[PDB]
Design a protein around this ligand. Structure first.
Ligand SMILES: [Cl-]
Ligand SMILES: [Cl-]
Length: 162
């Protein structure tokens, strides 16, 4: 298991514009297109993203290409963030995957806001971090995906994904 397979599981793959759990226009492997309610603002962002007139539909390769950029951007955002970088540096390889997953889902800003959990992770208090992470809108809104990521942080194994 690796970060790509992990996120492919959490996000799925859709080749036609769809609405995410929050109601936003997305395509591929969790690639957010726009927060705007207008399908046309979505198609426009899509075509801009792909470099062709897609009429809201893309191929598997196009989806994978977006996915590659997005994982890469997630890592780089972590590395450039003063609050996140130290956490990531302190973690083992599996737990690093767990942080990247939160960032991809909620952006750097969101994650960086989990001050207390972050501190617990850095200190390696796994059980305590897992309890604090669960006290979040995130967990309440997407409980199954949240439990999987949290177990990953608690255990340092890929069990929740196997
Ligand atoms: Cl893009
Ligand atoms: Cl869920």
């Amino acid at each position: 298991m690796n970060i790509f397979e992990m996120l492919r599981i959490d996000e799925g793959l859709r080749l036609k514009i769809y609405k995410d759990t929050e109601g936003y226009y997305t395509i591929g492997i969790g690639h957010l297109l726009t927060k705007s309610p207008n399908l046309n603002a979505a198609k426009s962002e899509l075509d801009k993203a792909i470099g062709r007139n897609t009429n809201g539909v893309i191929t598997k390769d196009e989806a994978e290409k977006l996915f590659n950029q997005d994982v890469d951007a997630a890592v780089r955002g972590i590395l450039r963030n003063a609050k996140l970088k130290p956490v990531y540096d302190s973690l083992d390889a599996v737990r690093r995957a767990a942080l990247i997953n939160m960032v991809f889902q909620m952006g750097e800003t969101g994650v960086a806001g989990f001050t207390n959990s972050l501190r617990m992770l850095q200190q390696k208090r796994w059980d305590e971090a897992a309890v604090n992470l669960a006290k979040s809108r995130w967990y309440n809104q997407t409980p199954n995906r949240a439990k999987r990521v949290i177990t990953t942080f608690r255990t340092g194994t890929w069990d929740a994904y196997k």
